């Protein structure tokens, strides 16, 4: 068994969701949400289930917060954290951000750092792996890998915010039990 270090992952959010105003109350954005799963892998042979759900943003036009927790039913154990370029002094969301013509333009964590104008979006995710030893430093272990949403300004293979059913269209990654 082994590791995930990369997931390449895209899909559709529907852009026929209604947009929000500023002051939508909770089932406004539920309707405007949608969720998926996928498995993730650590390094002890345990499959992990990722959950993200991927909510429009109140006052914002083209832009949904993905909330992420791996171990969904576990989550507070997890502490999952997602972040541009790093996975401290974040949560577990990003805001990802579309271009007028339904295609990935950025990505931004709860920190605030955001994606390079062009090229590849990684996103970078870590939990804990529950009921595992500390590592050598004595700090808690911790799953780490990124997960691959495209490149800017396409659509294969990339996130896209198209007048279409929300879906996975990509899902693929290097670890297994």
């Given at each position: 068994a082994k590791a995930t270090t990369s997931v390449n992952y895209a899909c559709n959010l529907d852009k026929r969701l209604p947009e929000l105003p500023e002051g939508a109350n909770r089932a406004q954005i539920l309707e405007s949400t949608w969720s998926t799963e996928f498995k993730v892998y650590d390094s002890f042979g345990e499959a992990h289930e990722l959950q993200i759900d991927f909510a429009r943003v109140p006052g914002e036009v083209n832009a949904w917060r993905a909330?992420?927790?791996v171990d969904p039913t576990n989550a507070d154990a997890t502490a999952t954290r997602v972040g541009i370029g790093t996975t401290d002094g974040v949560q577990n969301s990003f805001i990802v951000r579309f271009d007028n013509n339904g295609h990935l333009?950025?990505?931004t964590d709860t920190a605030g750092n955001v994606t390079s104008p062009a090229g590849q979006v990684l996103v970078q995710?870590?939990?804990?792996?529950v009921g595992a030893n500390p590592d050598e430093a004595g700090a808690p272990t911790r799953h780490t890998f990124d997960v691959n949403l495209g490149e800017i300004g396409t659509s294969k293979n990339t996130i896209t915010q198209f007048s279409d059913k929300s879906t996975t269209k990509a899902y693929e990654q290097d670890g297994y039990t």
């Open positions: 909330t992420v927790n333009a950025s990505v995710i870590s939990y804990n792996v």
